[model samples]
Target: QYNYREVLQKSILFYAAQRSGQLPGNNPIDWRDDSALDDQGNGGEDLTGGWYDAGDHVKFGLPMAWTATTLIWGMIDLANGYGGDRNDAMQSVRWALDYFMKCHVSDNELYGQVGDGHADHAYWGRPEEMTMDRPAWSLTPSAPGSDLAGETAAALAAGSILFSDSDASYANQLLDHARTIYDFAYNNRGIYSESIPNAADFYRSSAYEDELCWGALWLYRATGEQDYMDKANEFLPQGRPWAFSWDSKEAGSLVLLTSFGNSNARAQLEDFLQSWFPGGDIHYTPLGLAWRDTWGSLRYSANSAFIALLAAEEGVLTSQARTFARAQLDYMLGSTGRSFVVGFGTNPPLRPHHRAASCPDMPASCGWDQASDPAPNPQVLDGALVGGPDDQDNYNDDRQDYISNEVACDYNAGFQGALAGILQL
Candidate 1:
């Protein structure tokens, strides 16, 4: 069995490595320094901080928001599992939350994306050495992005609850932004990718309703307000979710809405979790991964496992759900003979498609040559989960093959929660 406590500690380190802008005095990552210092909005608004989404430097808000929400969710519900890493976990979350607040420049406008996806992906170098023309985009009434705004609102709402006690002032500030941003989402209804066309090639929004429901539920949880709960119920999707991901919030919403005895939410969540269980709709590999899709297969599995664990905790499907969660998590943690996480467990991935990890130390230049290098990444992306194996359990530690080797903020978000859940048990 893997050491859950140690893995949790490394997970925070992974996030620390993904940090952008000025480095903190207590920053754990040595390779990562002050980078993306000029990430500003169209109007020159300071947008310097936040995370480099995925293996690249673009701060795509959709997945970034989902990452924060999922991380804060685990920190709040699975508090006991963090052990000594609790404070560090909170700080990791604040890195994104602080950036989201900066993104929410006004009530009607939020900078949903920063850095051109194509331009950023073209340059294969460290974020610190990035010299590309990094531009920014925003969502407004004219070009609405309800999905992005709602997800950010959800993240902020969740963060508010996580810091309510230790940092009540910060929590209140987060809630205020969440409320206004939620209002922006509700008042201006449209997809995020539609507003920012560049994001369509990357993290596209399938629908906005799930985020609306998700944001409302999180707000309700933070405030105990009936209006937010009512809105949550209204926007909650009736059908079972295929997956809980950066692009989908239905399963996450079902977990929240079910708490109020919403029979439909309960049934949908059960159906969703049942599909991920053995002999259900989801296909399990020979090695026992609940394989969902070729792209980030382990991400889908871990996300579903997170929902199952949450459902079990809520008395939805105690035995079966927990069993399913354990099985899926074990598969990712090396039950399959090779760990999918970078820098942890037996035979962990050493060549995750991460620019910062791939690059050498300062005074040394990094470029596309490093991408083609067969050697392991110079920097250990500790606790970062990779895009996982094929259905037949085939995986390659190739940096160029992003489908199976890349690591992202959203990828680790649910996986971290699953680890915490397993540790608690």
Candidate 2:
């Protein structure tokens, strides 16, 4: 049997290292380089800017709350298994909570980025330089403009829960912060704004609406506030259940959303599973089951790690999910694990689809291929290939491959922090 305690232990170690600056400093795990490049390949600065970007916030702010809640939950699990070192666990929790609090842009609200950062906003084919100078949020630059309500609500809910066990002083502060974001995001109408200026227009797409609904529900759960619950009810129907996609598949998103503790959301996900996995392979990839497509054949390790956690969270195939999660944890620890060494050659291998030939100039398109790319040569890190063509689409032709950097954060953190939460549960 896979040891759940071992998996959670390793996850906490990885996350601790990340927070303590043991890993490469200034590299936020979520911002991919491709997401920031301009046509001239000049826009790639540290995409995260500062503060924990919290990938969950971009999808649904409540996911951010869920992420925080999960981390705290993991700490509690660690304490239970390891002699209840509440002080040690609380240290880590406090750091993450502080990071979340700093993410708040306004006294009562929060924005996604740490500071005003430039992002490439593109739709279909048209692209624009979006300067997020105010309280705003975006799942990623490639997505629509910043989502204020969803993100703010999530931060508030998470902040509230993180401080729930603290003294009255801190508890009161957390409550106030949660209320501020909630009032700004939820009070106006069925429509939630991506920014304060855009509050009047309901998101034209269902994808954005779903995210808002998800965030609202999270806030309600965190605070037990009737208004927040009402808002969640109001927005739930407008969210497009079909638009959830993470690498062209909807199952991962669905699994994640359902695991956040919304019964209706869980029901929607169950309906999806019934249609897709008639017999629940337990070994099936989330993307494959949700999208009815098999795009994850080459990216099994990372993608499967995600589904494993989702399954664990939902109490589906508990044994099977535990097994897969352990295997994935072992693989990551043995090979591409997160360590402080700058050049340990521990980075994940590039899939065949991500090889240079498949996307000579466009590294972003590498997702389409199956073979993993070779590790970056240590010499390359010293700036030898500064101006060379990194891929077919010139995707990584810029000073650095921003997409890889972003994926490093997104993939690694999900594996370490988010997955840890699942195993602990």
What local lDDT score does residue 227 receive in model 2, on the 0 to 100 scale? Answer: 72
Q: Judging by TM-score against the true structure, name the best candidate.
A: 1
lDDT of each: 0.91, 0.37
Residues 1-425, model 1: lDDT tens digits:
67877777888888898899998998888888899898898888999999999899999999999999999999999888876678889988899999999998988989998999999999998899899898999999999998999999999999999999999999999999999999999999999999999999999888999899999999999999999988986887867788999999999999987877888889888889889899999998988999999999989999998899889988988889999998988888889788888888899999999998999988799999989899999999998989999999999999999999999999889988888898888
Each model's TM-score?
0.99, 0.51
Total colliding residue pairs, candidate 2: 33
Candidate 2 residues lying further than 4 Å off, grouped into runs, are 1-96, 99-146, 166-168, 188-206, 237-264, 271-314, 323-409, 417-425
Candidate 2 residue-wise lDDT, 32-107, digit = tens: 2212111110122222322122111121223233344444433433333333334444544454445444444454
- TM-score quality measure for candidate 1: 0.99
How many clashes in each structure?
0, 33
lDDT of 1 at 229: 89
